């Protein structure tokens, strides 16, 4: 007698478990138990992952319903799970999306200067350096302060909520509520701060006093600040970190990108595709009875869309484990999801990674791990897979 | 077909695995495979642990022999494994041991002021607080700078070597050598620094120019600084952290110690006894064929002395999982080892814990975890078990 298969399989973000391919072949939708004890359907083929993400009857919003089977505990108010819907309903969709493009004047140069300044300080200090805590995450944090229009010096305390805010927990987390409420108060103060005129918060500040948005709540405006900061910083910092591992472990690739940096966009797209940053399947709740492969998913059941399931599917991406800069379908991966909830920061994230890698390869062309790869400490019960420290030398 | 049982069993430092008791009953010496692929004998009963630690033919020094079966890779020069022997041979044993007592004038008050100042800053900043990174470890770090006679401001960079120096790795760690050599150069500079006149380094500085120690190497003096700083900081910071978890999880105990703080020494002794801080058995290499329980250990074989094996042995400590402040045999645990290599900092460590707990209970009598216990991220492939962050509220 064995128990029902448990998810997630491994918190290690540097390699995919052999088990994923075996499951995809045998049972590309199959029943699993989450950390809460809930049952769920784990979907692991490209075809079935795409089907679920593209069918809105597999609802994100309804995952927050009281009494639903849960992947993990809410770390935000239940109405905040439908944040993008709330944004759209408030007529704020176009403005939010415009404010988080990497195309804003000066932004890319700010990114490059910031990356270069972080790297110079590591160089000055001498190897070993921690590329997560002292490069990737600070770069992510600086980027999102600039994108939000908020002071850089406020970034670190906001950042420090995230090790808790993005926990994947069986039970509610008291600290998450403390940090949430505090971070909300900060963003509400920002909207009242006349010095804040640029970026997302500057724009929301103005829209908040525009008559065309008079009956949009202050709660929604502050929520947008907290959610976009947290999602952006955690996602870009975590992605860049694990992409750096994948690069460092492929010196031939590292050298080619150092040699031909115009291939970096193609490289970052592949690093996105193979990225194991998302620790859990994307949760959705069936709002109807829906056939998914050989399984009739019943209304009220939880479905988990395993991103690496899709992204390493050899039917869609032949030789899935190899980075190939000339695939015919390079952006057709699901690293930024798909459908209604496709990542609004995908371009900004792509650019954070491109610029951080560009700068790292220039300043540290000899970059290598300073510890054997198995020594990396992978964060557990978290919504991302990340090494606690990423020690490198150069 | 199963593989040979692997060690360590779990990096979780908040509970002992049920498997340890089962093993102790069934097979209190049994064969296991280490992370290097080496075979070893894992010893898990009080009686057999004590036998091994008290028989010097189970050698610490010989664990460093080229070609021996290894628990993990050396992170120091092989001659440094015999550091205490080297100390004794150089006539430095009495001086080193005297310099690391908690009885030095002002030391306890420095500890208390430092603990109180760390706590006030957490209070000012507001919950949640990380009791590992922003209390236990800084307290350990400050204590050891003061004990060594070195500037407090030098503590943080020395501290940052330790996440690597105390790795438990299958392979040599390049960063460990970088940090070792750098930290050695620092301690050599300290011995040449005329401002350094107090503590262990002040005393070694003087003995280095005393004719009675003329043919003791500069290498040994600097090595003593690096080894005593690292072992002391890692051991006291890690112990206090996990003792804090054990306390916090027992509010009745926490309240009693807050109420009757004179029971704190008895409490710290029990917290020592149940402490899971050591991630691996203590390694020893047989220098002869020696009968240990039902096993004839052969010369050249590795033996691992599982401290919690001894310390949770119900034959020696009845109701082993319960903290009892009135045991008849309270200091007979093996938390500081036993025999030739008994911890030279045991009193200093006891006092760090007592004072840190005293101060925490006074400043934060309402101290509780701010996250569910399962959310703590336990450091892997490391010589200690420690949570990466210890989020608390009060
Ligand atoms: C490489 C970097 C990034 C990756 C891999 C990533 C990944 C993802 C994925 C997979 C989703 C889909 C969630 C779902 O469908 O259940 C998503 C949505 C989202 N992302 Fe990203 N993201 C990245 C960067 C960013 C940035 C920079 C921001 C903000 C500045 C951001 C903000 C959001 C938000 C607010 C959502 C929710 C969308 C919705 O519910 O409609 N992301 N992201
Ligand atoms: C609660 C705190 C502490 C614990 C639990 C602890 C634990 C231990 C243990 C189990 C050993 C035996 C190693 C073996 O036999 O293989 C040991 C030895 C040692 N400890 Fe500690 N220790 C603590 C505090 C300290 C401090 C504060 C220092 C230095 C300032 C220190 C320095 C050393 C050294 C240098 C050895 C090697 C002894 C030898 O090889 O003869 N320890 N410790």
Chain B residues touching residue A180 (CB < 8 angstroms): none
Q: Which ligand gives the minimal distance to the CA of A144?
A: 1
Cα(A258)–Cα(A247) distance, integer angstroms: 11
Q: A1-394: what fold?
A: Cytochrome p450 (1.10.630)
Confirm if A371 and B173 have CB atoms less than 8 A apart: yes
Chain A nearest CA to B177, separation (Å) = 10
- Tell how far the Cα of B227 is from the centroid of ligand 1, in angstroms: 46
Q: What share of chain A is helix, strand, coil (3-state, %, to 5)?
A: 50, 10, 40
Tell whether residue A383 is among the known ligand binding residues.
yes
A341 marked among binding-site residues: yes
Give the pairing of strands B302-305 and B290-292.
unpaired
DSSP, collapsed to helix, strand or coil, labels residue B58 as: strand
Instruction: State the smallest CA–CA distance between residue B379 and chain A in angstroms.
Output: 6
A394 touches chain B (CB under 8 A): no
Residue whose C-alpha is closest to residue B165's, from B266, B77, B244, B252: B77
Which numbered atom of ligand 1 lies nearest the CA of A307? 10
**Quick one: closest CA in B to A388, which residue?**
B388
User: What's the CA gap between A323 and A254, in Å, rounded?
Assistant: 12
The closest alpha carbon to B96, from B233, B217, B220, B239, belongs to B220
Residue of the CA atom closest to atom 1 of ligand 1: A349
Please check whether residue A190 is in contact with residue A196, taking contact to mean a CB–CB distance below 8 angstroms: yes
Ligand closest to CA A310: 1
Using the Cβ of A169 and the Cβ atoms of chain B, whether some distance falls under 8 Å is answered with yes
Return all residues near B17 (Cβ < 8 A) that are at least 6 apart: B9, B10
Which residues of chain B make contact with A167, given a CB cutoff of 8 A? 371, 375
Buried b / exposed e over A117-153, threshold 16 CB at 10 Å, is ebbeebeeeebbbbbbebbbbbbbbbbbbbbbbbeee
A393 interfaces chain B, CB cutoff of 8 Å: yes
Closest ligand to the CA of A60: 1
The reply to whether residue A173 touches residue B372, judged by beta carbons under 8 angstroms, is yes
Asked if B10 is an interface residue toward chain A (Cβ–Cβ < 8 A), one would say no
Ligand index nearest the alpha carbon of residue A99: 1
State in Å: Cα A349 to ligand 1 middle.
9
> A28: closest CA among A316, A313, A337?
A313
- d(CA A32, CA B97) in angstroms, rounded, equals 57
DSSP for A27-69, please give it: -SEEEEE-TTS-EEEEE-SHHHHHHHHT-TTEESGGGGSTT--
Angle at alpha carbon of residue A299, lines to A296 and A300, rounded to 5°: 125
Sketch the domain layout of chain B as residue ranges: 1-394
Contact A393, A122 (CB under 8 A): no
CA-to-CA distance for A189 and A195, rounded, in angstroms?
Answer: 11
Residues of B with CB below 8 A from A129's CB? none
- Residue B114 assigned ligand-binding role: no
Cα B375 to Cα B354: distance, rounded to the nearest angstrom: 27
Are B169 and B75 contacting, i.e. CB atoms less than 8 angstroms apart?
yes
- Check B375 against A127: CB less than 8 A apart: no
Q: Residue A381: list chain B partners with CB under 8 A.
A: 374-375, 377
Kindly tell me the burial class for residue A48, based on how many C-beta atoms sit within 10 Å of its own C-beta (0-12, 13-18, 19 or more).
buried
Q: How many residues does chain B have?
A: 394
Residues before each break in chain B (C–N > 2.5 Å)?
Answer: none
If you measure from the C-alpha of residue A38 to the centroid of ligand 1, how many angstroms do you get, rounded to a whole number?
25
Structure tokens at A317: 């991406």
Q: How many CB pairs under 8 A join A and B?
A: 86
**Residue nearest to ligand 2 atom 18, measured at CA:** B343
Question: Which structural technique was applied?
Answer: X-ray
- Report the alpha-carbon distance of residue B275 to residue B284 in Å, rounded: 21
The encoded tokens of residue B359 equal 């101060």
| Mutation for B interface: A12, A14, A74, A128, most B CBs within 10 A | A128
Determine, for residues A388 and B393 on separate chains, whether the beta-carbon distance falls below 8 Å. no
Interface residue B378 vs chain A (CB under 8 A): yes
B371 CB neighbours in chain A (<8 A) are: 164, 167, 169, 173-175
Instruction: Name the strand (E) or helix (H) holding A257.
Output: helix A251-259
Of B128, B372, B391, the CB nearest to A171: B372
Asked whether the beta carbons of residue B128 and residue A378 sit closer than 8 angstroms, the reply is no
Q: How far apart are CA A308 and CA A306, in angstroms?
A: 6
| Chain B contact for A379 (CB, 8 A cutoff) | yes
If you write DSSP's letter for every residue of B175-214 in order, what string do you get? HHHHHHHHHHHHHHHHHT-TT--SHHHHHHHHHTTSGGGT
A290 membership: H or E segment, kind and range: strand A290-292
């Amino acid at each position: 007698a064995t128990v029902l298969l448990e998810v997630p399989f491994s918190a290690r973000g540097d390699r995919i478990p052999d088990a994923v391919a075996e499951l995809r072949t045998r049972e590309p939708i199959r029943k699993v138990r989450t950390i809460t004890g809930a049952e769920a359907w784990l979907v692991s083929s490209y075809a079935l992952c795409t089907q679920v993400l593209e069918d809105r009857r597999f609802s994100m919003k309804e995952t927050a319903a009281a009494g639903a089977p849960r992947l993990n505990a809410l770390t935000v108010p239940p109405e905040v799970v439908n944040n993008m819907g709330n944004i759209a309903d408030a007529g704020l969709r176009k403005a939010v999306m415009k404010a988080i493009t990497p195309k804003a004047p000066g932004l890319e140069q700010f990114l490059r200067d910031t990356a270069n300044s972080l790297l110079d300080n590591l160089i000055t200090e001498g190897a070993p350096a921690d590329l997560r805590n002292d490069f990737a995450d600070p770069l992510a944090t600086a980027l999102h302060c600039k994108v939000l229009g908020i002071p850089q010096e406020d970034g670190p305390k906001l950042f420090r909520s995230l090790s808790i805010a993005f926990m994947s927990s069986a039970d509610p987390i008291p600290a998450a509520k403390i940090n949430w409420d505090r971070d909300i108060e900060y963003m509400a103060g920002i909207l009242e701060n006349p010095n804040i005129t640029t970026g997302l918060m500057g724009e929301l500040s103005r829209l908040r006093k525009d008559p065309a948005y008079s009956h949009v709540s202050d709660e929604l405006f502050a929520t947008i600040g907290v959610t976009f900061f947290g999602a952006g910083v955690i996602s870009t910092g975590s992605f860049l970190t694990t992409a750096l591992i994948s690069l460092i472990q492929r010196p031939q690739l590292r050298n080619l990108l150092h040699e031909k940096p115009e291939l970096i966009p193609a490289g970052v797209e592949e690093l996105l595709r193979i990225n194991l940053s998302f620790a859990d399947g994307l949760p959705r709740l069936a709002t109807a009875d829906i056939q998914v492969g050989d399984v009739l998913v019943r209304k009220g059941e939880l479905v988990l869309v395993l991103l690496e399931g899709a992204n390493f599917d050899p039917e869609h991406f032949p030789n899935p484990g190899s980075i190939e800069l000339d695939r015919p379908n390079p952006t057709s991966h699901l690293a930024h999801g798909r459908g209604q909830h496709f990542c609004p920061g995908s371009a900004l994230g792509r650019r954070h990674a491109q610029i951080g890698i560009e700068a790292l390869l220039k300043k540290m062309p000899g970059v290598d791990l300073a510890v054997p790869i198995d020594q990396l400490v992978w964060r557990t019960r978290f919504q991302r897979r990340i090494p606690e420290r990423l020690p490198v030398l150069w």
